[PDB]
Amino acid sequence: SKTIWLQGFNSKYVNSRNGQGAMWCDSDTPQAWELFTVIDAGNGKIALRGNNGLYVSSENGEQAMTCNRPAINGWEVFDWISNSDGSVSLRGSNGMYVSSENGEQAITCNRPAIDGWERFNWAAA
Ligand SMILES: OC[C@H]1O[C@@H](O)[C@H](O)[C@@H](O)[C@@H]1O
Numbered sequence: 001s002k003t004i005w006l007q008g009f010n011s012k013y014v015n016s017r018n019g020q021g022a023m024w025c026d027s028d029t030p031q032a033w034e035l036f037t038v039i040d041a042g043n044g045k046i047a048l049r050g051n052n053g054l055y056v057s058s059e060n061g062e063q064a065m066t067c068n069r070p071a072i073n074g075w076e077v078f079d080w081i082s083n084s085d086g087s088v089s090l091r092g093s094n095g096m097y098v099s100s101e102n103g104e105q106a107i108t109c110n111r112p113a114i115d116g117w118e119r120f121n122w123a124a125a
């Protein structure tokens with residue numbers, strides 16, 4: 001039921017970009033576009049509903065990640081990985097990890113391992 005924000009390796013916050021184009025980890029402070037409702041999608045999987053009421057997609061790693069899907073299936077469910085330092089990682093349905101890409105390009109879900117860029121600090125809004 002909880003609304004959260006996600007802070008990437010570069011200290012900026014994950015931004016839905018209002019469903020226009022790709023998501024970026026580029027905002028200074030968490031505001032409306034940086035808030036995501038965590039959705040229990042069944043069997044330990046989660047989805048994320050953005051400010052626009054649409055759902056985050058891995059895009060199967062074929063393009064940068066987006067927040068424009070009107071319904072959850074799948075590319076829209078993720079494993080919520082709880083890391084030892086209290087950070088979170090997200091694993092898409094293709095087995096790859098959501099990456100802030102250090103804010104140098106739009107967010108992706110095509111990297112097979114958790115490194116610095118794939119670990120997010122988070123908090124309930
Ligand atoms: O306040 C709503 C949104 O406005 C946009 O102009 C900013 O880029 C977002 O970071 C913010 O969440």
Ligand SMILES: OC[C@H]1O[C@@H](O)[C@H](O)[C@@H](O)[C@@H]1O
Binds near residue numbers: 041043045072074
């Ligand atoms: O379409 C596949 C997906 O559909 C969703 O409605 C389920 O909750 C997911 O766990 C499933 O992988």
Ligand SMILES: OC[C@H]1O[C@@H](O)[C@H](O)[C@@H](O)[C@@H]1O
Binds near residue numbers: 074
């Ligand atoms: O059905 C698997 C996936 O197919 C894609 O074409 C859709 O854009 C995704 O939203 C969906 O989860």
